[PDB]
Design a protein around this ligand. Structure first.
Ligand SMILES: CCN(CC)Cc1ccc2cc(COC(=O)Nc3ccc(C(=O)NO)cc3)ccc2c1
Ligand SMILES: [K+]
Ligand SMILES: [K+]
Ligand SMILES: [Zn+2]
Length: 358
């Protein structure tokens, strides 16, 4: 009842980029996480939860039937056919086992949602690949086939009857797929902090700026925090949570929190350009446990330095398990650029959240 669930299956290693041996999204990402969780003694403290394959009806909560069928057909394609299809999307590869692994990747999150919503566990972490946060209703994107967390949010609502879900995306990239899926939906609050640099950084979208607040019934329920300088640190992230995310989260009163738990903002990542210590993620995880009765599920997104990502997962897991947060050496104060971004996001979201008004 007070336990932390962990989902991992060997199938998560059974796909890789056939035409580029240097591709950063590779099986070692999850192997190294599991090895470090074990050597740190954290794996044995978790409740191992079985994965399952997502069903078609679960996928259809987010994705179109035509897209699901096309993705299913990739399991029977030749390498040349896989490459031709992958080239129709941005930043994607395909492999004959990609679809099977992607189905287990979604299902791993759903299994944890079941355990957490029924109070059989307190919280949990899926150690899954492929990632999900860029996947869209009818498109692969950014190493993603199916939108793991968007499916999990709608599943929590349909199966477990949850009214409000908060999705917190701390991967260094903007989860535009999640934003698009819930753009008009006030029942799923999406918060993303991400490198932006005025669009210079992938995925180069105007709608990754803080002016994209959602639309229609969803106006105010999409919150982007774009960083416009590299080198952000733990104090920048903690300050963003203290000034912006936590006040809104308590006002929103979510009944489940899902985290797009990428670790490409950790120091040493080859792509992220940030300098966040792995230990920061103990604090950020702790800061999210005070809403939704602690019903908190993390799912792996990006993160490409094998050691940095494994250290970030372990730091998050220590907090899920209830270990006291470490002291961080830095003061917690944000740099000027981070403060500028936080203030601008608050300015854009002020009209929709009493907890931000001054
Ligand atoms: C020899 C020097 N190069 C190494 C090969 C450096 C280099 C740096 C950045 C590159 C960026 C792109 C654009 O494409 C993406 O960045 N894609 C992408 C990345 C991460 C995630 C993710 O983690 N999301 O959460 C999603 C999508 C393409 C090529 C690049 C090459
Ligand atoms: K993000
Ligand atoms: K939304
Ligand atoms: Zn990323």
């Amino acid at each position: 009842a007070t336990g932390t669930g962990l989902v991992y299956v060997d199938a998560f290693t059974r796909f890789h980029c056939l035409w580029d041996a240097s591709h950063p999204e590779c099986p070692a990402r999850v192997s190294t996480v599991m090895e470090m969780l074990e050597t740190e003694g954290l794996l044995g403290r978790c409740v191992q939860v079985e994965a399952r394959a997502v069903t078609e009806d679960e996928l259809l909560l987010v994705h179109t039937k035509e897209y699901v069928e096309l993705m299913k057909s990739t399991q029977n394609m030749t390498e040349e056919e896989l490459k031709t299809l992958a080239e129709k999307y941005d930043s994607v590869y395909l492999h004959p086992g990609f679809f099977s692994s992607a189905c287990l990747s979604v299902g791993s999150v759903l299994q944890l949602v079941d355990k957490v919503m029924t109070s059989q566990l307190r919280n949990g972490f899926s150690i899954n690949r492929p990632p999900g946060h860029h996947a869209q209703a009818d498109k692969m994107n950014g190493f993603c086939m199916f939108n793991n967390l968007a499916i999990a949010a709608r599943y929590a609502q349909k199966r477990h009857r949850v009214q409000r879900v908060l999705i917190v995306d701390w991967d260094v990239h903007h989860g535009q797929g999640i934003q698009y899926i819930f753009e008009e939906d006030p029942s799923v609050l999406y918060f993303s902090v991400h490198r932006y640099e005025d669009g210079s950084f992938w995925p180069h979208l105007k709608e990754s700026d803080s002016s994209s607040v959602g639309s229609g019934a969803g106006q105010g329920y999409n919150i982007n925090l774009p960083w416009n300088k590299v080198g952000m640190e733990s104090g920048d992230y903690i300050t963003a949570f203290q000034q912006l995310l936590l006040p809104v989260a308590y006002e929103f009163q979510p009944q489940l929190v899902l985290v797009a738990a990428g670790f490409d903002a950790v120091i040493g990542d080859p792509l992220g350009g940030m300098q966040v210590s792995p230990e920061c993620f103990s604090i950020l995880t702790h800061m999210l446990k005070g809403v939704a009765q602690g019903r908190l599920v993390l799912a792996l997104e990006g993160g490409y330095n094998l050691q940095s990502t494994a250290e970030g997962v372990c730091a998050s897991m220590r907090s899920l398990l209830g270990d006291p947060c470490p002291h961080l050496p830095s003061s917690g104060a944000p740099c000027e650029s981070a403060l500028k971004s936080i203030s601008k996001t608050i300015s854009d979201l002020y009209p929709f959240w009493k907890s931000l008004q001054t």
